Every structure is written in structure tokens, then in C-alpha cells.
Amino acid sequence: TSQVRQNYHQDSEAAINRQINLELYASYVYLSMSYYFDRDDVALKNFAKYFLHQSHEEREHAEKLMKLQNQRGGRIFLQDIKKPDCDDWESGLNAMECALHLEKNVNQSLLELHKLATDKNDPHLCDFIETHYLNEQVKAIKELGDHVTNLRKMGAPESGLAEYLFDKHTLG
Amino acid sequence: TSQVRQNYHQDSEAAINRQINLELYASYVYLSMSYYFDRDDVALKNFAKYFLHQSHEEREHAEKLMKLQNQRGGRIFLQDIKKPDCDDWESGLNAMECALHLEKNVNQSLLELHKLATDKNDPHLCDFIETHYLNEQVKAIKELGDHVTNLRKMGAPESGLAEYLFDKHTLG
Amino acid sequence: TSQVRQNYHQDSEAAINRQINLELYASYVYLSMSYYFDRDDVALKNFAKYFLHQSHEEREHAEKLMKLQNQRGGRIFLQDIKKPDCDDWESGLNAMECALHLEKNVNQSLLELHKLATDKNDPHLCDFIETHYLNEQVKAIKELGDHVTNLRKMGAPESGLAEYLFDKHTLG
Amino acid sequence: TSQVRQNYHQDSEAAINRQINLELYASYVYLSMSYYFDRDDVALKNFAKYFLHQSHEEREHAEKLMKLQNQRGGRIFLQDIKKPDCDDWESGLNAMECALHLEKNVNQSLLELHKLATDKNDPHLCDFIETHYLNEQVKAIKELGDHVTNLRKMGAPESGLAEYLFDKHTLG
Ligand SMILES: CCCCn1cc[n+](C)c1
Ligand SMILES: CCCCn1cc[n+](C)c1
Ligand SMILES: CCCCn1cc[n+](C)c1
Ligand SMILES: CCCCn1cc[n+](C)c1
Ligand SMILES: [Au+]
Ligand SMILES: [Au+]
Ligand SMILES: [Au+]
Ligand SMILES: [Au+]
Ligand SMILES: [Au+]
Ligand SMILES: [Au+]
Ligand SMILES: [Au+]
Ligand SMILES: [Au+]
Ligand SMILES: [Au+]
Ligand SMILES: [Au+]
Ligand SMILES: [Au+]
Ligand SMILES: [Au+]
Ligand SMILES: [Au+]
Ligand SMILES: [Au+]
Ligand SMILES: [Au+]
Ligand SMILES: [Au+]
């Protein structure tokens, strides 16, 4: 037992490890998306930059979870990072919809983690999740919903002009 | 009777109170409009900012009227601020048309107030209305008419691209 | 159903709309108070400034709640803003006591909202209320209690000198 | 007839000369008041400064009227400046009340002048009076009413402490 461990349940430790893996997977998905839009036959530079930024942010979230694991005296156990389900994301609108789905999945995982922490009476872990993750997820989901709405209204994905102008004016 | 009151008719005092209520109502309408465009399924940020600015300006106008009431020795009597007639404003173009209607209604109220002040031989009140309200209303009405004209020409509300580009280039 | 909505109960949405209306009502009450002290027969400028600042702060709180409603995929429904119960607030001390009562009422509403959010297992909403509203209310209530205590000790409301000096030294 | 005169009625010219005399008289009254509070047995320096400032402002108003008279091609005819009715103003509160009376008298004269200008269809003169005199009078009357209210509430004129503290905190 760690000399620092106090009020840290084994279930919480396992759930934190699972969340670390999920965040790394999300970072990988965003990396794939970013370099899809860097292809010469897609060529939407600002979409690529947006998704690369999201990938790096996901990596930061995973690293913060690992730091938390060590702070509380838990032990990090890493697992395979599965490859993204898709190789070709087919458009800016489709990529935004996939990102919205992914962010809502991550949010659901975080909500389950918070429920577990509440059940184990771990106020520090609950506060950590609330302060560093829940509002970030809400903001990300709202932003992605806004992007999807605007792309749909502009006529994407059929109108390539819509995605070009969205890339220039919203993501630029 | 107030120690400062001079050449201030009771009818003018009542009309000023009515105008205060009308300005507060206009502020409320603009607030509703602003947060309609903040919805995830509307998502026109610059429309939202424009209407929030208009809401705050209307509040400032109401406060200036209250200051005038106290300056002349009248007594402020506040009333319920009625909720806006609409919950869903349905588009940028429709919201601009509604704002044009509202601003013309406020202008008509101000013109009636000026007529009352003229009939009561209250040059200070006439000058107050002329200096602080009439040209502001004319400018606001002209600007809203310009916005409506441009949105109609661009193809709004059917073309969501038109409203997106108007949001970026005119209101941005 | 909104594309962004997740773990947001209908009861929470309704309670948020009620809280929006309550905050707007509080802003209206503070506006009335502020322009009572601007009267020529009251003439306590710093009381007026204090209550005007409180009114604007209440408006900001209402707008933050509306932003939250949109973030979570709820839909804002506005209602009439009822006029303040009083037209004449009768003194600085009486106005401070009324403000204390109002702030405690708003705090009770926020506590009920937090209880509802806890019952619906909405950690994001609980954290929102805790972070942005609860401590602000505690601080406001403490400040108003301090003001009431000092005004009472100085001999208000009977001693107009007490209210004049409190206006100059505490609120100035 | 002056080479510049146009749409300037003789009645308006005479009324302007009367207003010049009234403004000079008001300046004289304020000068008397100012040096009453400079007496060693009164000794309220900030009251003296306040009334000296008012005296100089009245002189400026008279000079602006003379400039207007020359601009429109009228001819200035000066008259005796009568001495103030009082040599001893008896207190700060009494002086403020006398100043309020004087400012309301000047305002009534200006309103009669504006009525005359309106009857003679002299829009330039009406605008001159509105822009440079009417709101200044309203503000001065409101300020003097505020001062009287505060001095009365503090316990003046019986409480010399009230006038001392008003001199320090309001007029200082
Ligand atoms: C597997 C998640 C699919 C999300 N989604 C919805 C619509 N689109 C184009 C993608
Ligand atoms: C009640 C005021 C209606 C104004 N108006 C005109 C056209 N549109 C779309 C709105
Ligand atoms: C209706 C709330 C009344 C609060 N209250 C208490 C004492 N005073 C002067 C006011
Ligand atoms: C001749 C004008 C008198 C004005 N007045 C009213 C009360 N006090 C003390 C002075
Ligand atoms: Au796939
Ligand atoms: Au896919
Ligand atoms: Au997907
Ligand atoms: Au997808
Ligand atoms: Au409607
Ligand atoms: Au409507
Ligand atoms: Au409308
Ligand atoms: Au409309
Ligand atoms: Au009441
Ligand atoms: Au009350
Ligand atoms: Au009350
Ligand atoms: Au009260
Ligand atoms: Au006298
Ligand atoms: Au006198
Ligand atoms: Au007098
Ligand atoms: Au007097």
C-alpha cells in the first residue's frame, strides 16, 4: 500500500486507468482526423489544425489523469490504444459529427466515474472530475454542435463551397 | 410637490413612466433574441452579440429616462415588464424584421411623447427627447432596414449560407 | 431533442428557467432601489450607485443562467418580470434590510436548485451552482448584514446624519 | 439695421437684454454669498468656494448672452446691477435655499424667453436657449435640492456639526 494512499478505493483506481485509456484513444482518433484533412484530395488546412489541437488536448487530459493516479497513491496500468474505427472521415461535416459522438461518449464515461466516486465517498476525486473535466466536456460538445449546425445550414457536405468557407471563416 | 419641480406637467410624468416601461420591454425582447441565436441548433454568434448589445443599450435608455424623471421632480412608478411575444425568432432575417418593427414602435411612442411635451410648453423635455432619443431611433431604424435589405438580397432565410456569411461579414 | 443534450433532466431545465426569472426580478428590484436614492428628497448618491451595481450584477447572473441553459441543450422560456413590491424604500437602512431579505430568498432558491440537481445526479449542474452562485450569495448576505449592523449602530434611520456618513464612508 | 440681422424680433432683443441683467444679478448674489462664508465668524471655506464658482459661472452665462446679442445683430443695453437683497445669509442651509429660489427664478425667466422666441418663430434663439441654458438650470436646481435635503436631514442649521461635515464631505 502506498504511503500516500487515503480514501482511494480500488474501483476508483481501476476506473481512472480505464479513463486514461479512453483519453488516449480519443487523442488517436483526433490525430487520424487531422491528417485526413491534410490529404491532397481533401485539403482543408483549418479542419486539420482544429483536430490536431483537439488531439493534443486529449493527450493533456490523459496525462492529468495519470498525475492524479500517482497523487492518490494508485498505480497506472496502461493498455493498447486501439486504432480509430475509420481511416477515411469522408468530409468536414462527417468528421464533426463523429467528434460530437466521441465527446459525448467520453462525457458519459466521466459521468459514470463521478457516480462511482460519489458512491465511494471520495470528495477529492469528485471535485477533480467536476473542476477539470465536466465543464470542458460540456463546452466541447456545445462547440461541436454549433459547428455541425452551421455546416448543415450552409449546405454541407454536398456543397464543397460550404466546407471551404466554413474552414476559412469559422476554423480560420 | 417636489422642491425642484417646475413646468413639469403630470401628463408628462405619466408618459415618461410609460416610456420607461417600453424601453425595459424592448431590452427584454432583445435579450430573448440574443439568446435565441446562442442555441446550438441556430448558432449565429454575431447575431447573438448584436442583439445583446441592443438589449444593453435599451436598458441604458430606460435608466436615462428614470434619471430625467428624478431631475424634474417626478416620481418613478415601475410596472411589470411583459415577456416577449415570441420564444422562437425563426431566423436572422425574421429577427431583424421584428427588431425593425419594435424600433419603429418605440419611435412612434417617442414622437407622441414629444408632441405631448410641445403641447404642455415644456422646452426642456422636448430638447431632452430630441437630443437623446430621436436621432438614435432614426439611425437604428436605418441600420435595421439596411440589414433586412442585405439579408433579403443574399437569399435569406432559405439560404443558410446567406445568414452565415452575413453573420461573418456584416455583424462580425 | 437537442444534439448536445446529455444527463439534463426536464425538471432541471424548468428550475433553471424559474431561476432566470428570479434573477431578472432581483435586478429590477435593485434598479428601483437605486433610483429611489436618486430622488431629490432622498439624495444619497452612493446608496444609489451601490444598488445600481447590484442590479447590473443580477442581470449578469441571469445571463449566465441563460448561457447555461443553452450549453446543456435546454430551451429558455421567459416570463413576465414582476414589478417590485415597493415604490418607496423609506431609508438606506430599510433598503439594506429589504436587500438582505431578497438575497436570502435567492439563496434559498439556489439551494433548492442544487438539491434538485443532486437528486437527478447532474454533477455538472451542481458544480455550476457551487462555483458561480453559492459563495457569491454567501458573500453578498454577509456584506448586507454588515451594512445593516453598522447602520443600526450609528442610529439609523432616525439619525439622518448616520445615513449621510454611512453613504460617505462605507459606500463612498 | 444691422447687416447681419435676420429673423430677430425687437421683443427678443429686449428680452435678451433683460436676461443679461438677470444673469449679472445672480452672479452678484453668489459673490455676496461666497464672501459671507469667508467671514471669521462663519468660516466654511468650501461653501465659499462653491458659491464663488457659481458666481463665475453666472458671469459666463451673461457673457454668452451678450455674444448671442451681437451675433444676431441686436444691440446690448446694460442696466444697473442691483445689490443682493441680503447682506447676511445666516447659514449654509439658508444660503442653499436662497440659491435654489434664485435658480428657479432664472429658470422661469429662461422659459418665458423660450416661449417668446417660439411665438416669434425664431428657431435659432429657441435652440440656443435649449442647448446652453435649460438643462444647465435643471441640473443646478436638482443639485441644490439635493444639498438642501442632505443639510436638513443632517440636522442643519441648528447642528453646526452638520454644516461642518457637509462642508468637508459634500462640498470638499
Ligand atoms: C459511430 C458514431 C456515428 C456518429 N455519426 C452520426 C452521423 N454521422 C455522419 C456520424
Ligand atoms: C408583429 C410585427 C411583425 C413584423 N414582421 C414583418 C415581417 N416579419 C417576418 C416580421
Ligand atoms: C418583505 C421582507 C421584509 C424585510 N424587512 C425586515 C425589516 N425591514 C425593515 C424589512
Ligand atoms: C426670498 C426667497 C426665500 C427662499 N427661502 C425659503 C426658505 N428659506 C430659508 C429661504
Ligand atoms: Au468507420
Ligand atoms: Au465513422
Ligand atoms: Au464515426
Ligand atoms: Au460519424
Ligand atoms: Au410571436
Ligand atoms: Au414574432
Ligand atoms: Au415580431
Ligand atoms: Au417579425
Ligand atoms: Au412594500
Ligand atoms: Au418593502
Ligand atoms: Au421589503
Ligand atoms: Au424591508
Ligand atoms: Au434678505
Ligand atoms: Au434672504
Ligand atoms: Au433669500
Ligand atoms: Au432663503
Numbering used by the authors:
A (entry chain B), B (entry chain A), C (entry chain K), D (entry chain O): 9 to 180
Verbatim from the authors:
Au(NHC)Cl is a cytotoxic gold(I) carbene complex with a 1‐butyl‐3‐methyl‐imidazole‐2‐ylidene moiety as the NHC ligand (where NHC stands for N‐hetetocyclic carbene), coordinated to the gold center by a direct gold‐carbon bond; the second gold ligand is a chloride. The adduct between Au(NHC)Cl and HuHf was studied by cryo‐EM measurements, resulting in a high‐resolution 3D density map at 1.51 Å. The octahedral symmetry of HuHf was preserved also in the adduct and each protomer closely maintained the backbone conformation observed in previous X‐ray and cryo‐EM structures of apo ferritin. The cryo‐EM structure shows a novel tetranuclear gold(I) cluster, located in a surface pocket of each subunit where it is bound to Cys90 and Cys102. The pocket in which the Au(NHC)+ fragment lies is quite shallow; it is defined by the space between helices A and C, and the BC loop. The structure clearly shows that the two sulfur atoms of the Cys90 and Cys102 side chains coordinate to two gold(I) ions each, at a distance of 2.2–2.3 Å, with the exception of the distance between the Sγ of Cys102 and the second gold(I) ion (Au2), which was 2.5 Å. The coordination distance between C(2) of the carbene ring and the first gold(I) ion (Au1) was 2.1 Å. The gold(I) ions formed a zig‐zag chain, with the distance between two consecutive gold(I) ions being 3.1–3.2 Å. We hypothesize that these short inter‐metallic distances can be explained by the occurrence of significant aurophilic interactions. As mentioned, the observed density allows only one carbene to be confidently positioned, although the ESI‐MS data suggest that each gold(I) ion binds one carbene moiety.
